[PDB]
C-alpha cells in the first residue's frame with residue numbers, strides 16, 4: 575500500500591510503520607559545518623573485485639540490482655564499521671527534475687539522485703536476521719549530479735526497458751559496481767534507518783562526499799520506468815525519495831577535514 579503519492583507517500587507512512595517517527599530515522603540533512611571531524615575514523619574498505627550480480631527487479635518503488643551474498647565476495651568494512659558487511663543489492667532514488675531526487679541533502683542541497691549499496695553484517699548470518707539488529711546494515715550512499723555520463727552506469731540504464739512495470743525482473747549478471755564509485759571515499763557517517771518501509775532502525779549510514787556525475791539521458795531513462803504494474807494506468811516512477819527527517823539526538827561524523 576505504501577508509496578510516494580499524496581495519499582500514500584512519506585507523510586502517511588507512520589500509520590502502518592510507527593517507527594517512522596522514531597529516534598534514528600533516515601535520511602537527514604548533512605550540515606557540513608556542524609559535522610564532527612573524527613581522526614579515529616578508518617578509511618572505508620570497499621572490496622568489490624569478485625561481486626556477482628544476479629538480477630534486476632522493478633518492485634514498484636525503485637529497481638534493485640541483486641547480488642549473490644552467499645559468500646564473502648563483495649564486502650564493505652573499515653570506515654566506522656566493526657567487522658564485515660556483505661553487499662546484497664543496490665538501488666537508486668531520483669526526481670521528476672534534475673533539481674531534486676536525493677534522500678540525504680548537503681547543506682539543504684538536493685542532488686538529482688542517490689545510489690544506495692545495501693550491505694549486511696555477516697555476524698548475523700543473513701539479511702533477514704541483520705535488519706532486526708541495531709548494527710545489522712551498512713548502506714553506502716552516493717549522490718548523482720547531472721553532467722558528464724557515467725560509463726559504468728550504462729549497462730544498468732540499457733536494461734530498464736525490459737523491467738518497465740512493477741513486478742518485472744530480468745537476469746543481470748557480470749555487473750561491476752566499482753564502475754559506480756567516485757574517486758574519493760571521504761564520507762560522513764551517522765546511525766539511522768531504512769528510508770523505505772519498514773523503516774527499521776538498523777543502518778550505519780556512510781554517505782560519500784564526492785558525487786558521481788551522470789548524463790541527462792541516463793537519468794531521463796530512469797524516469798521512463800513505471801510504479802504501476804503492466805496493464806494498469808501509467809504512473810511514471812519519479813520522486814521516489816523520502817525527505818530529510820529530524821536528526822534528534824545524533825551527531826554526524828566526518829572522515830575528512
Ligand SMILES: NS(=O)(=O)c1cc(C(=O)NCCO)c(S(=O)(=O)c2ccccc2)cc1Cl
Nearest residue numbers: 635636665690692713767768769770771772
Ligand atoms: N533506501 S535504503 O535505506 O537504502 C533500503 C531500501 C530497501 C528497499 O529495497 N526498498 C524498496 C525500494 O527502494 C531495503 S530492503 O530491505 O531490501 C526492501 C525491499 C523492498 C521493499 C522494502 C524494503 C533496504 C534498505 Cl537499507
Ligand SMILES: [Zn+2]
Nearest residue numbers: 665667690769
Ligand atoms: Zn534507498
